[PDB]
Amino acid sequence: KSQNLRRLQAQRNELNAKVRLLREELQLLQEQGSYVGEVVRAMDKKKVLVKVHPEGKFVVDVDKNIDINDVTPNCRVALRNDSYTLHKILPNKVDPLVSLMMVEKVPDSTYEMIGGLDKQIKEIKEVIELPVKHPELFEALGIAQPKGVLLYGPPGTGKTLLARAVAHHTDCTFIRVSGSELVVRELFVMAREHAPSIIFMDEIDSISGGDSEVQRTMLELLNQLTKNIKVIMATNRIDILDSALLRPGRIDRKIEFPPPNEEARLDILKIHSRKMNLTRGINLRKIAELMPGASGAEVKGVCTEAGMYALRERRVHVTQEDFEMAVAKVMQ
């Protein structure tokens, strides 16, 4: 009876604690609201040098139960409620590059679905994960360092996707400085922090000193250089670029992308056709029959258009002929 009575004591004390923090909860919410902001990190006795959201600066203190030793720069959390003194830490809130990756969301996760390129992936995997994950045979083979790969090919067919895929089999990173819209030399710090990184470029001539300037601008810092960062430049033509890049070896690797032949186009059209429903049998060769100058894209386009040409008749299986009017449509 006393044991069961103390079980009832546990029930009554639990409900009484509920009414504790509800009662002092309704008197509690009459207090203040802490601010929030990124910082440049401390130097001295307490210290922060914050920059709060509306107006970006102050130097504040830190409470006893905060252990100013771990709170590192660009890791926003604050509480200087009224007098301006810290309390605790919050969600790291995605650092800088997390921004220009998710923002330029251009890079689309890719892995091994490259449509019939094996010499190309043998050569880029020869010079993009051997200088990262096995440096030991380079520091005993007498080689200094391989860095910088130029991807010249037709528009399409290997760009932004080979340099994506072998960047993420290796789980390296994939920084793209293609375009300078909203923010050089500061990017190197981010790459250095990542430790290992891969920088990618832009290819515009048609689908004066565009991005060969930054290209070398980071080969000047990259030549003497905290070492496993590998620039990648994609261009449509090898002849259009600078004579300064024509400086063997400034581009330790000139990988070549041909336009796809018959069987490689049945491989890429095999994969993009592995995106959807078809039927009991296609025998995809007749579509590849007129592949003649095609392009990587010229394959994703016709497979989506074959899907839509199956969608127009409210039909749930992509037949043979929707391919034939897809590739027979896009000859424009």
Binding site: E55, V60, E220, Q224
Partner: protein
Amino acid sequence: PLEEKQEEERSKVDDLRGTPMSVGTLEEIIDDNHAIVSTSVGSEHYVSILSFVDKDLLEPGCSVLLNHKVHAVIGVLMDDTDPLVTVMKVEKAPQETYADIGGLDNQIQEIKESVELPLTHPEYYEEMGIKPPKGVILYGPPGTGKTLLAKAVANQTSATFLRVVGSELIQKYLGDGPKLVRELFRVAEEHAPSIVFIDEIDAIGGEREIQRTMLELLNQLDGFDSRGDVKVIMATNRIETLDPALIRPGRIDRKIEFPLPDEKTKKRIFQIHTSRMTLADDVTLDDLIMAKDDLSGADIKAICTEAGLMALRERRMKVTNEDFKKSKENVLY
């Protein structure tokens, strides 16, 4: 007991200096007891000063800091938050020596005095009488010594080593450009002594922003005075292109150049890189001296790199000089 009056600060003074102190950029210093401060908002504030603060960073107006409730100049802006974060003020040096350059020897000797000898033995000149000369240009054909190698070796036995390039000098947005070399020769000037590299200035790709920018490496080089501002070393591939205004053998002093290789440095510079490699049986010069009827300084770097890599695809640290031929056709053919 000299450390007895230090603890009065944290009970009478740090109560003033130690609150949600605000930081606002300082302005025109009215005389000693006051100052004006535009805060973070834009509202000016005729603040007072502090007695115990050892004021040395008054320049109208680097980001001074303030008090929150009352307004003053409570502290100063150590942790400067250095503009041009990534300009290569080298702390971890690269890997080049007096030996691995090994080719052009006259030239590295001349730059070795022209930069290094006012540092490694500065007691020639004032005992002799002359001034030390300013920075050089060192132009050349492409790959003729790595122009940026005899400056890199001029790095690694000296003090700080600040660089620039034609690309950091020119600008897109700008309209307002010649700022880069304002505060590049202001940060450069401040170290006393640091060497500034106008890496490959060649200015190509309206035009008048480039004109004024060149006019400010020109004038901001030599306007009225200079600190220890040797190291203005300019690498160049096109000496006949840039405006001959830089050299008034004042703005740009004594300058040193080179023919591309000779065969003596085809051998002597060929056997530096492959000294790291493992080929030993048929190291040759017949495939090296008259092969390309002069091959750059790099083409031998790329022939060693592409040679060992091309014999490294088939996984052996062996001595094959027929794979070396596939490296030759592979890199320059």
